[PDB]
């Protein structure tokens, strides 16, 4: 438990020094903290937050004080208390698996993965979040990028068959065209909403494609009817029926990425956390599979020099080769093992006859009302897997992190797009605006926004990670452990973030669909 008032008095006792108001404030807050034995977990943390606030005040007021060492050590005790308050007061997790597929028809691959979770979690309610108003964003994004490609190939048509037109100069010349075609749709969209507010996105898109690119609406209507039917048969949950999310101040950020930027991934980062906050449960990317029974391959020792991802892929590749829960699965890694070690995997799987002996079930889980558990990989945290109770404190901090991070972006982006300038002038005007507002504490965050307009159309662009991605979760965790809000410069080490780790026993992360969907962007091909 946390140190008591009398102990802290003895801890920072300095003879021949006056009892400062800022000091007694710390003792008053700590004494009344130890009387909150009946309050909620959140209320207990909001108290430790004030205690830390007052301690930071004292240290900043009396910089040469002899109490500082004791109070700087007392600060560490407060962080320890938060983690103990986290790992000791646990409530049941809302048994809900949240998946997301928005802006297009759900893929057969995603449905297969999802069913694997259903088969081993019959007590969990599944929700595949879709947008009934926006099934054509994907085809729209594909229609414009494809037309923008041909227009870029029409130019440079004389030198595309020889060098001097590398993939670097091609994507640049193509983006300025995409920006004009993208800027044009947003104007038509914005003008159609004020003229007829009863229209949905799909109504604006399918008429926009029928005029500027000669698309058949009868084929688009049948694509919507097909996409709606397919997802409703698989635990579909319409975002337009998510009233709490649709009324909050984070819905414009969702529609900003969906309609204007066509970044379905970013719109999912915004949606997943708000759903987890309002309902609670477990979010999972569609390329995640249930955890493997720990005692399954216990007898096959892992090689010394291989990575963890290798072995996890081997385990899944072996399971799918011999049980075929997902047909056509790869074996790139299982085929790298000795013939005798392959026989070991084959043998153990031959002794198993049911899936419950292969994949584990989530079952009765419990988490702190303060925490949001996140997945881990060799690069750090990753929001492909999340576990949180309803209305957890971190989920609110994470939402606030994203909402605050989009303000800084849109504060410098809106004044640049409002002017009907080309891509190059907008980018330069957008970069000149971030470096002005850039203060020596959010530098890294601002250094990642200069590419915001090029997301989805360029290789190796990772701005989503900083806006709504894991970077915003790391900042939220820092907000918690630092008793503050609005963190921008991450100073947490791996050991700090491991307090919010999802156990590797609950998620199989190194799947084929995941190791194929990730970044692999040396794919300079040039088409034909």
């Amino acid at each position, epitope marked *: 438990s946390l140190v008591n008032r009398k102990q802290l008095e003895k801890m920072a006792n300095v003879r021949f020094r006056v009892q400062e108001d800022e000091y007694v404030a710390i003792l008053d807050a700590l004494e009344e903290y130890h009387n909150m034995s009946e309050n909620t977990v959140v209320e207990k943390y909001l108290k430790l937050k004030d205690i830390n606030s007052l301690t930071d005040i004292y240290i900043d007021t009396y910089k040469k004080s002899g109490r500082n060492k004791a109070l700087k050590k007392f600060k560490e005790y407060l962080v320890t208390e938060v983690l103990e308050l986290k790992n000791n007061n646990l409530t049941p997790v809302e048994k809900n698996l949240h998946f997301v597929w928005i802006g297009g028809q759900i893929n057969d691959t995603a449905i297969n993965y999802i069913n694997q979770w259903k088969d081993v979690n019959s007590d969990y309610n599944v929700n595949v979040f879709y947008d009934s108003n926006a099934f054509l964003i994907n085809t729209l994004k594909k229609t414009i990028v494809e037309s923008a490609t041909n227009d870029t190939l029409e130019s440079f048509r004389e030198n595309l068959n020889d060098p001097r037109f590398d993939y670097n100069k091609f994507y640049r010349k193509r983006m300025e065209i995409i920006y004009d075609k993208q800027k044009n749709f947003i104007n038509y969209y914005k003008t159609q909403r004020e003229e007829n507010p009863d229209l949905i996105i799909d109504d604006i898109v399918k008429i926009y494609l029928s005029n500027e690119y000669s698309k058949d609406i009868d084929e688009l209507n049948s694509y919507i009817e097909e996409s709606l039917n397919k997802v409703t048969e698989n635990s579909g949950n319409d975002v337009r029926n998510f009233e709490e999310f649709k009324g909050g101040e984070s819905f414009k950020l969702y529609e900003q990425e969906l309609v204007e930027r066509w970044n379905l991934a970013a719109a999912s980062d915004i949606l997943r956390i708000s759903a987890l906050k309002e309902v609670g449960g477990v979010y999972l990317d569609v390329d995640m599979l249930p955890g493997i029974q720990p005692d399954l391959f216990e007898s096959i020792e892992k090689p010394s020099s291989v990575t963890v991802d290798f072995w996890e892929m081997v385990k899944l590749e072996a399971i799918m080769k011999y049980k075929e829960y997902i047909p056509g699965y790869t074996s790139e890694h299982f085929d790298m093992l000795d*013939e005798e070690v*392959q*026989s070991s995997f084959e043998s153990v799987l031959a002794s198993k006859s*049911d899936k419950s002996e292969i994949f584990s079930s989530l079952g009765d889980m419990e988490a702190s009302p303060l925490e949001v558990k996140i997945a881990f990989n060799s690069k750090g945290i990753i929001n492909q897997g999340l576990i949180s109770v309803k209305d957890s404190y971190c989920s609110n901090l994470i939402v606030k992190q994203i909402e605050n991070r989009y303000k800084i972006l849109n504060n410098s982006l809106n004044p640049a797009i409002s002017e009907d300038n080309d891509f190059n002038t907008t980018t330069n005007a957008f970069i000149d605006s971030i470096m002005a507002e850039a203060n020596a504490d959010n530098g890294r965050f601002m250094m990642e926004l200069g590419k915001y307009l090029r997301v989805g159309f360029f290789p190796d662009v990772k701005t989503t990670i900083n806006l709504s991605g894991p970077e915003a979760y790391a900042a939220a965790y820092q907000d918690l452990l630092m008793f503050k809000e609005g963190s921008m410069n991450i100073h947490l080490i791996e050991a700090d973030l491991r307090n919010f780790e999802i156990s590797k026993t609950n998620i199989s992360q190194s799947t084929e669909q995941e190791m194929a969907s990730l970044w692999s962007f040396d794919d300079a091909r040039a088409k034909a």
Partner: antibody
Amino acid sequence: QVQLVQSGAEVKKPGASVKVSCKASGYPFTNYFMHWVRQAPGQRLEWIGRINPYNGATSYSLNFRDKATITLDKSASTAYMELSSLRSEDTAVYYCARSTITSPLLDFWGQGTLVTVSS
Amino acid sequence: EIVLTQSPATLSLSPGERATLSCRASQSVGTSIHWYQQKPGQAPRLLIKFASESISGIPARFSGSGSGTDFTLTISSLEPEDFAVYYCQQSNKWPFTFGQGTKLEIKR
């Protein structure tokens, strides 16, 4: 207990086709792969191919990739085995066996079915 | 294609003697070798799985061993009901193949 009851003996002329059945009972049908094996008079056993329940995922031997076609009736817990361009050298017994995994670990076999091909 | 060569083709022994049947593979199959027993008029019966693992309902006198390319089936004491044909199949590589078999004949 566990049983694999196969169709009756068949007799077709060269060119025709034949479908052998294999009804499984006594165990969760969806937990075992259904394999098929040939055995010509006085010759070795030849793996024809396999089908798994819960989906039509099939894998055939190279020799039978063109001649055989394995399907199932999951509703009845049966497996079907069709042979097309019947040749006289296709005269053999045809067994259906269950396996816990993809690869043939044939723990329980059927009585087999004799298909005779001749003019 | 993995060729499995069993030897001998025919083995003449009397009840109570020691039978040792070989199965050679053209390339390493790890330990994924299975043994089957077939008497005339009946379907094969599984004896050993994965070179050496025991099967339920199979007497102890049957045992198997091997690794890589060379595999052995041993019958400690031959019983009259043990005289039949024995096949080995490999399971590690596709397509999956059987041996030609070994006919175990009573010697008189």
